Design a protein around this ligand. Structure first.
Ligand SMILES: CC[N+](CC)(CC)Cc1ccccc1
Ligand SMILES: [Mg+2]
Ligand SMILES: [Mg+2]
Ligand SMILES: [Mg+2]
Length: 340
């Protein structure tokens, strides 16, 4: 039963949820992986990991992924959550030296993950391990694009650090720019490709319908998050939230900001439904009747299919995950699953 303030009837009806069959194993393996890489304390894993629904999130998004591809993606994704928490704790404690070191450690590991599998900072070693596996699925051109995209994500996270320490709550249009990167829009978009086991030629993946569909899928997810994480983020002195920068710069009140964010989240859905028809038409014309044609077609179709799936996974993840249940924390500014 979703709060009316967060309820989106169109998702509930027109976007039926999906679940990868490897999910049950995925849940236990990724949990073990957080345990053995020491990414979270053992007693925080035992009592919170599964309840975080990190693996559920991805198993409802990357449908059709080879099991090991999914595993790589879920370990990486769960690492990303821990990184968000560490980034957040570096800010709350003003660990700028620590943050900056980590930052540079990450840029380096990204280009050279083998060399960092056993780095003393467990957060890095954990990064290097998932990244190393992600690079084993596709040609080095895909790997280079991922690194080029994730290099931008680290820097976006750096800008966030400069904003929170100062106090700068970005402008709405500025936030819209920053959010496509802090949410890692283009990472999730790249990982569509190993999930369907094909590196899409630029001509294919930059087709305007593929591009807009991909964009729209990611705007929904990110803006839904801001909507749903807004209470926990307010409590933790976040400044990075569409809700937040609407209040601050447009003098909308709480209930006015939430409404404008909701309206923008709904337009994503209906814009997605329009371009989805186009994306699928394209897939259907790729199939020129050659073996390569069938391959591109099937891969684009699957990717658009998973772009659609993201809507439902993200939606339900925000209501099933302990990550956002701030109303249950002894200290609302400090989530229990976080190392403080
Ligand atoms: C994992 C993606 N997420 C979780 C709500 C939306 C589906 C936001 C996110 C992006 C990047 C890092 C951490 C969280
Ligand atoms: Mg966060
Ligand atoms: Mg963040
Ligand atoms: Mg958030």
């Amino acid at each position: 039963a979703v709060p009316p303030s967060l309820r989106l009837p169109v998702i509930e009806a027109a976007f039926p949820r999906q679940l990868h069959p490897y999910w049950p194993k995925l849940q236990e393996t990724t949990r073990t992986w957080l345990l053995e890489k020491r990414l979270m304390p053992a007693d925080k894993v035992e009592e919170y990991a599964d309840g975080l629904c990190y693996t559920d999130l991805m198993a409802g998004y990357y449908l059709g992924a080879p099991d090991e591809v999914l595993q790589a993606i879920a370990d990486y994704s769960a690492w990303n959550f821990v990184w968000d928490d560490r980034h957040d704790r570096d800010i709350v404690h003003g660990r700028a030296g620590a943050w900056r070191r980590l930052r540079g450690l990450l840029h380096t590991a990204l280009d050279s993950p083998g060399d960092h599998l056993h780095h003393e900072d467990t957060l890095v070693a954990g990064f290097a391990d998932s990244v190393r596996r992600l690079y084993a699925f596709l040609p080095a051109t895909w790997n280079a694009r991922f690194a080029r995209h994730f290099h931008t994500v680290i820097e976006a996270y750096d800008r966030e650090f400069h904003n929170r320490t100062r106090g700068i709550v970005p402008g709405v249009e500025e936030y819209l720019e920053l959010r496509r990167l802090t949410f890692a829009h283009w990472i999730w978009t790249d990982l569509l490709e190993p999930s369907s086991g094909c590196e899409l030629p630029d001509a294919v993946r930059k087709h305007p319908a593929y591009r807009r569909a991909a964009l729209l899928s990611q705007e929904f997810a990110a803006w839904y998050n801001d909507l749903c994480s807004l209470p926990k983020e307010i409590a933790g002195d976040e400044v990075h939230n569409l809700g937040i920068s609407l209040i601050t710069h447009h003098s909308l009140t709480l209930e006015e900001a939430i409404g404008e964010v909701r309206r923008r989240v709904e337009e994503c859905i209906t814009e997605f439904l329009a371009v989805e028809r186009d994306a699928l038409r394209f897939a259907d014309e790729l199939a020129d009747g050659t073996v390569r044609g069938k391959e591109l077609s099937g891969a684009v179709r699957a990717n658009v299919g998973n772009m659609r799936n993201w809507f439902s996974s993200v939606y339900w993840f925000h209501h099933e995950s302990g990550r956002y249940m701030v109303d249950s924390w002894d200290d609302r500014s400090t989530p229990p699953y976080v190392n403080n």
